[PDB]
Ligand binder design. Sequence first.
Ligand SMILES: COc1ccc(-c2cc(N)[nH]n2)cc1
Ligand SMILES: COc1ccc(-c2cc(N)[nH]n2)cc1
Lengths: 212, 212
Amino acid sequence: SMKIDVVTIFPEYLQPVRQSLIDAGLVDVAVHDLRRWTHDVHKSVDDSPYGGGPGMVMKPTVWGDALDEICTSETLLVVPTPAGYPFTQETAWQWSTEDHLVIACGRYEGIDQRVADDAATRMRVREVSIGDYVLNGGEAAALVIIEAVLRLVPGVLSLLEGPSYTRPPSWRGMDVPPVLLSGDHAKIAAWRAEQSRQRTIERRPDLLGFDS
Amino acid sequence: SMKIDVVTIFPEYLQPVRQSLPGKAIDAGLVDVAVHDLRRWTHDVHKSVDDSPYGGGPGMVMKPTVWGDALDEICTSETLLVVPTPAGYPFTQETAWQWSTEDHLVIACGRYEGIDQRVADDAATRMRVREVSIGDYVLNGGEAAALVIIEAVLRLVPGVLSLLEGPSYTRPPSWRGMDVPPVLLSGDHAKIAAWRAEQSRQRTIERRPDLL
Ligand SMILES: COc1ccc(-c2cc(N)[nH]n2)cc1
Ligand SMILES: COc1ccc(-c2cc(N)[nH]n2)cc1
């Protein structure tokens, strides 16, 4: 059993998770509007940065009140950010056995650093990046993290994968590799091992300890 | 002026994209995103999109005949065909900048174990094809990756909407016992810039030593 809470100023962006990645009852996912923890009539969640810079920063006060209500000492607080530790398959396996994830989604130029720092005095906190590109906010990263983690949960139970094929054996004058039709398990395993190592050196040489 | 077509068996998953697009950019004709149900191009009464893998293995493979008809209708010679896959070349910020000046992106979203390799190989004989990964984790299908790519590319198109960045702060100057670093309130802007550079250097050493 896992519970996931997502906090955001754009709750509508999280609807793609509504169609189960939940239907079984293994996991429960809930989405919260950050603005519900404001108190002024304009529901202001942002202010200009100290020390200069472009754009706006999310205020710590509103975030602190939201996390106070949602989190406990058992919670793993997840904060997507381009400046984070890398989120990898290893991370996904680690988080797949957690009881409670809370994902805090930033907008504007980001969240006041004291939010994560205050939270770390009460619970475990992980600032993470899902890849070396920049988004407008954390919501799409939240969807990626939820999908990668939930598929590993017990109950929903290196090198690059090579190419796959299915019927018909000839299509537009292009043939499925004959070894794959041969029924020879040893030869098929060897061919697939070689396609994978060939794809890896071409596309991801870093995975085998080479440059670029 | 960019057109994006997305092809998927789960069209509702791409809901956040159309919802995040400002009317002004659509009205100005800067961007158009369209989502297509792959089952529109199936041949049989059961609307089949998958079949068993040649050479054996777990799961299923998406049929080349269905995908071939879909891409024949949607793509032209000027199309950049994007195929998300864990076995792809890395999608990075430089990729996003490159794709931001394209006239037509088509994103082919896989499910099951992937798409028969002859689909991409045939398409590459008449248009540019890019198989790409958005990070070193595995998803159930390409839809969440399509959301990430669309957001990272379109935020670089005007008006559509090295080292790691250090921490950001805003009001109040003191919160839950934590003060904003006094240098940021000093009015010494050369010193502030040097402080930010050192914060960035330390964060990069701790979280991303690969960047150094
Ligand atoms: C403003 O709030 C955010 C939160 C997260 C991101 C992000 C994370 C990654 N790997 N790319 N972009 C950007 C902005
Ligand atoms: C079966 O269709 C897909 C398509 C893409 C993926 C993917 C891409 C990345 N970076 N992780 N997972 C998985 C399955």
